[PDB]
Amino acid sequence: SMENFQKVEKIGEGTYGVVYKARNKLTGEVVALKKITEGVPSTAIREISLLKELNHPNIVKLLDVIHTNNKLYLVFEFLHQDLKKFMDASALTGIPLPLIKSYLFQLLQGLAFCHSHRVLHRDLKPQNLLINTEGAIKLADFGLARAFGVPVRTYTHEVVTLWYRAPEILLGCKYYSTAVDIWSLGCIFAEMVTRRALFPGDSEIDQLFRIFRTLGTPDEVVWPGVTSMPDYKPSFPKWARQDFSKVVPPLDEDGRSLLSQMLHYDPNKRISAKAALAHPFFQDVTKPVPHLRL
Amino acid sequence: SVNEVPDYHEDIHTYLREMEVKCKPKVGYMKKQPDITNSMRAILVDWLVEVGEEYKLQNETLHLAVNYIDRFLSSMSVLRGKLQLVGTAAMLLASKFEEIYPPEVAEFVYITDDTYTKKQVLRMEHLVLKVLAFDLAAPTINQFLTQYFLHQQPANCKVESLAMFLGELSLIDADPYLKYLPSVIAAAAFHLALYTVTGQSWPESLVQKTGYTLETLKPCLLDLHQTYLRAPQHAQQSIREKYKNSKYHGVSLLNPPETLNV
Numbered sequence: 001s002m003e004n005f006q007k008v009e010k011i012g013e014g015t016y017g018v019v020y021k022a023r024n025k026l027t028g029e030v031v032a033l034k035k036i037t038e039g040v041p042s043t044a045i046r047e048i049s050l051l052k053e054l055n056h057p058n059i060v061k062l063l064d065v066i067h068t069n070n071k072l073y074l075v076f077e078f079l080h081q082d083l084k085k086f087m088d089a090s091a092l093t094g095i096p097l098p099l100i101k102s103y104l105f106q107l108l109q110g111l112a113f114c115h116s117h118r119v120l121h122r123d124l125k126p127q128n129l130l131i132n133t134e135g136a137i138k139l140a141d142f143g144l145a146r147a148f149g150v151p152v153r154t155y156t157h158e159v160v161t162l163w164y165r166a167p168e169i170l171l172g173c174k175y176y177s178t179a180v181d182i183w184s185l186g187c188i189f190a191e192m193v194t195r196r197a198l199f200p201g202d203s204e205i206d207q208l209f210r211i212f213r214t215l216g217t218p219d220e221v222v223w224p225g226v227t228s229m230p231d232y233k234p235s236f237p238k239w240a241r242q243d244f245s246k247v248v249p250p251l252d253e254d255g256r257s258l259l260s261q262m263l264h265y266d267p268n269k270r271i272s273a274k275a276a277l278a279h280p281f282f283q284d285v286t287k288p289v290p291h292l293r294l
Numbered sequence: 295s296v297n298e299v300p301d302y303h304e305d306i307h308t309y310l311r312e313m314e315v316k317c318k319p320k321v322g323y324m325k326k327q328p329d330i331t332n333s334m335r336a337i338l339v340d341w342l343v344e345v346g347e348e349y350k351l352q353n354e355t356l357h358l359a360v361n362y363i364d365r366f367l368s369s370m371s372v373l374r375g376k377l378q379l380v381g382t383a384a385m386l387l388a389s390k391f392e393e394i395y396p397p398e399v400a401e402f403v404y405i406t407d408d409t410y411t412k413k414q415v416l417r418m419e420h421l422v423l424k425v426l427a428f429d430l431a432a433p434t435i436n437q438f439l440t441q442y443f444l445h446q447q448p449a450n451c452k453v454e455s456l457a458m459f460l461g462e463l464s465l466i467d468a469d470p471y472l473k474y475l476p477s478v479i480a481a482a483a484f485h486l487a488l489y490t491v492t493g494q495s496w497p498e499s500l501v502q503k504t505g506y507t508l509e510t511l512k513p514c515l516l517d518l519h520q521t522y523l524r525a526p527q528h529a530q531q532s533i534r535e536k537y538k539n540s541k542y543h544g545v546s547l548l549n550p551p552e553t554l555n556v
């Protein structure tokens with residue numbers, strides 16, 4: 001229980017509760033402690049049950065659950081910071097490309113492992129992607145995740161933090177699947193390169209229009225079924241699709257190829273995390289430590 | 295389609311096969327319960343079927359809750375007056391895991407007709423989480439069935455519904471069905487449904503996916519055929535009632551075949 005833990009400082013906070021840095025007094029291990037009516041919340045039930053199954057080097061490790069009459073603590077391995085903080089700290093240097101590549105490779109490994117174990121993450125924003133001083137990056141916060149079936153069955157709609165939300169969610173499709181998480185990582189790949197969110201919308205319609213302005217307004221040819229989708233409107237402006245080299249100018253040819261396959265409109269055609277691991281962008285991938293103190 | 299996860303369905307299947315062995319209840323537990331019987335359990339499960347109808351819950355939710363109850367009862371001795379409290383907390387946990395809109399705790403107290411308080415239900419929720427060590431993502435018959443249905447040539451809605459119905463019937467009787475894994479009951483239910491409706495058999499493509507043959511499926515298949523033949527006379531009827539509905543293509547009104555010709 002908590003007698004062996006010494007709190008150090010607050011590191012994070014949303015509706016879920018609050019997260020502290022702490023240390024195990026007996027082993028020295030540094031941890032994150034997340035402290036949490038209708039009884040135990042569904043987000044915590046999902047987070048704990050799914051994370052108990054997911055042991056992978058690019059998934060944050062749940063070490064323990066301390067379950068009291070009054071409170072629930074989740075104990076995680078400690079990571080130093082989120083990717084958002086690191087992007088900001090790299091403001092006028094940029095993030096060196098070997099690090100971007102290493103980070104994306106790791107994120108795809110973590111995600112493919114989720115998908116292989118029937119888990120959709122559904123909130124891959126940079127605040128949920130944690131980095132340590134050794135060069136690792138890991139998926140965190142599985143509160144919004146879900147165990148899926150094959151084939152998928154209708155799940156919660158309008159999921160995913162809006163800037164990272166896939167068009168099939170924005171257009172209200174009856175089903176969505178693993179491709180939603182790849183859309184998000186695509187948005188993250190772009191963002192690691194520019195340090196700016198690729199599609200920073202303020203409402204669902206503005207998010208769609210920003211997507212359309214960058215990738216072209218989709219039509220039956222590019223995305224069969226699109227004009228029949230529940231929230232498609234035949235009044236939607238028709239923007240031409242804009243050369244990918246203009247979308248993320250510093251990206252080479254391989255990078256551009258992988259980004260375009262991660263941001264494909266048709267969720268059937270979009271690349272899987274598993275297949276992305278073999279993309280020629282990663283031909284020279286390594287695992288360097290981050291270039292800044294964390 | 296990505297809705298059928300082509301790049302992951304095989305990994306997922308292998309993983310569920312691995313998990314169903316680890317999540318498996320103790321086959322002999324009911325003998326070691328001093329106060330409850332297979333027939334009290336049959337009553338609870340049939341009651342959960344109705345609760346699921348009343349609140350429009352997913353079939354997956356029902357199957358999960360039964361998995362929790364059986365795993366719980368495998369280590370915890372329970373008096374008859376408390377069985378329904380275990381079952382209610384289980385259905386609550388299954389709903390929070392699996393449903394978009396779980397019913398509130400007050401609704402779970404109300405369908406027990408105030409046999410238990412909100413405080414008892416919530417205390418039991420925590421006990422069930424503690425006994426299962428939050429291991430709630432359990433494989434079900436349903437999760438294997440939906441993958442098996444992708445091998446139909448072509449899709450037949452009556453086959454699907456009837457296979458679900460038969461899978462569901464298996465939940466009511468601990469004897470014999472505690473001795474079979476979810477993947478095996480689903481396979482027997484799928485074969486039996488396919489044969490009742492179309493005259494066809496367990497396809498070669500599913501022999502390739504699962505390693506199961508009509509030979510490995512025979513013991514479960516004989517049990518399931520009897521359960522199907524006797525369903526009209528079973529003391530518990532909620533599943534038959536439910537599967538009369540057009541949602542499930544009235545499949546409980548279909549006649550079981552007299553023989554299987556194995």
Ligand SMILES: Cc1ncc(-c2ccnc(Nc3ccc(S(C)(=O)=O)cc3)n2)n1C(C)C
Pocket residue numbers: 011012013016019032034060076077078079080081082085127128129130140141
């Ligand atoms: C919600 C949640 N559940 C568990 C964690 C979690 C797990 C392990 N390590 C950390 N470490 C950490 C996070 C954020 C920052 S920050 C905002 O100051 O850059 C600094 C360190 N956090 N989390 C995170 C996502 C808050």
